[PDB]
């Protein structure tokens, strides 16, 4: 009989769905073939990026005395970091607002 | 019922529970994280497809994914993502 099923996410130590990522790579018209390690690598990278943004956003929410991450906190996390901001420079975060930034010459004497 | 409209919400929530056990996430931030995951997936997958095509490779392997990650992600973000992906692939290979 079939052995007890283990998700490839569990095999890889990931939260993100290696199986779903593999199916999206196969069905996404990216190549004729998709190697077995490709969805694992991609799920690991997506999970890493998600963890980084969610952790910075949770830090921002905690600093704002809020227990739930909101688009403002995601925006603050992304824009207060050069690497994330350059990754997502061309991106608009809905309901994210903008960083508070007033040019010095506008401030009163 | 309505048709099963899959998303990354549960995986992003699991990652949130790991990185910050006691904080939550609103629906709009949840949708933004879904959009982010989809966008980065599309970027890395498109870049990997282009790498394979440039090299006359029919297959997308973890090595094309690694190169695509190095090309798209900046600075230290790139090497940490590469470390994560390599660790996951090694663990998966060890089963």
């Amino acid at each position, epitope marked *: 009989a079939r052995a007890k099923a283990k998700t490839r996410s569990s095999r890889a130590g990931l939260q993100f769905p290696v199986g779903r990522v593999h199916r999206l790579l196969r069905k996404g018209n990216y190549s004729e073939r998709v190697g077995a390690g490709a969805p694992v690598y991609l799920a690991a990278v997506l999970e890493y990026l998600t963890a*980084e943004i969610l*952790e*910075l956003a949770g830090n921002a929410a905690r600093d704002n005395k809020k227990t739930r991450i909101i688009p403002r906190h995601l925006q603050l996390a992304i824009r*207060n*970091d*050069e*690497e994330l901001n350059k990754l997502l420079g061309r991106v608009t975060i809905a309901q994210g607002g903008v*960083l508070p930034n007033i040019q010095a010459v506008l401030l009163p004497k | 019922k309505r048709s099963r409209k899959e998303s990354y919400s549960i995986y992003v929530y699991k990652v949130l529970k790991q*990185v910050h056990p006691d904080t939550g996430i609103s629906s709009k931030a949840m949708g933004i994280m879904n959009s982010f995951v989809n966008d980065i997936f599309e970027r890395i997958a498109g870049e990997a497809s282009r790498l394979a095509h440039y090299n006359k490779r029919s297959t997308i392997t973890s090595r094309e994914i690694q190169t695509a990650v190095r090309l798209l992600l*900046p*600075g*230290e*973000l790139a090497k*940490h993502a590469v*470390s994560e992906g390599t660790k996951a692939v090694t663990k998966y290979t060890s089963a």
Partner: single-chain antibody, 227 residues
Framework: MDIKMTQSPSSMHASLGERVTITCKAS??????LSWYQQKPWKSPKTLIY???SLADGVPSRFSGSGSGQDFSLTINNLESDDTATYYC?????????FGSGTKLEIKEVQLQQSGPELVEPGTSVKMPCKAS????????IQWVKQTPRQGLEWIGY????????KYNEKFKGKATLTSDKSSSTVYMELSSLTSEDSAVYYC?????????????WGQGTSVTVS
């Protein structure tokens, strides 16, 4: 509520070529954000392990780390002559970064230029510069660490040149003030009202804004001495 970091062996001796284990115990859960630093005497610390398991660049596979949560360990397999130094665990999982007490071990291109020694009278102010080169200046925080023989390493604070953002250790509010200069790629530390306990070596250290990144490159250390 600071995370006190407890290194179990305060000192140890070992012959050449055998394994060594150093244990560092955290006061609270720090979620694998722990680093290990090797400091040979009179020289700046070099990072060995970051994210509690990952070797820093250029570190030989002889060094290895393990653990997560509150218990962490460092292992050196093939002891070589130069492995004699003081080893510090550094947690950066919570806002006041805390170094370990340090384990003295005895056996049988990024540049952060930092100014030379300083002699000052009490009540004065001093301005340690940290000229950084070999990397994109704005992308990495510059972290400042104070080293004394009585208190070990103490984390002062950091400046993020990308947005001039700062964080300071509560022990150094007012005492320290950090500023950046994008044009010269230089970071300056103010010390206000120098006092006797301020005689210490101050290191600027580069740390990426990535949460798992650690203090990776260090300045040579500015030895401030107050009369």
């Amino acid at each position: 509520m600071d995370i006190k970091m407890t290194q179990s062996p305060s000192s140890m001796h070992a012959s050449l070529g055998e394994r060594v284990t150093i244990t560092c115990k955290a006061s609270q859960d720090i979620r694998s954000y722990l680093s290990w630093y090797q400091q040979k005497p009179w020289k700046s610390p070099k990072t060995l392990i970051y994210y509690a398991t990952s070797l820093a660049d250029g570190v030989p596979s002889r060094f290895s780390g393990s653990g997560s949560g509150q218990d962490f360990s460092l292992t050196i397999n093939n002891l070589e002559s130069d492995d004699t130094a003081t080893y510090y665990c550094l947690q950066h999982g919570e806002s006041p970064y805390t170094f370990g007490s340090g384990t003295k071990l005895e056996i049988k291109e990024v540049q952060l230029q930092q100014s030379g020694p300083e002699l000052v009278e009490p009540g004065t102010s001093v301005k340690m510069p940290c000229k950084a080169s070999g990397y994109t200046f704005t992308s990495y925080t510059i972290q400042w660490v104070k080293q004394t023989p009585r208190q070990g390493l103490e984390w002062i604070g950091y400046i993020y040149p990308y947005n001039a953002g700062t964080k300071y250790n509560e022990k150094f509010k007012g005492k320290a003030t950090l500023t950046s200069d994008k044009s010269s790629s230089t970071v300056y530390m103010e010390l206000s009202s120098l006092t006797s306990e301020d005689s210490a070596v101050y290191y600027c250290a580069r740390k990426s804004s990535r949460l798992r990144s650690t203090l990776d490159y260090w300045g040579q250390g500015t030895s401030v001495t107050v009369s």
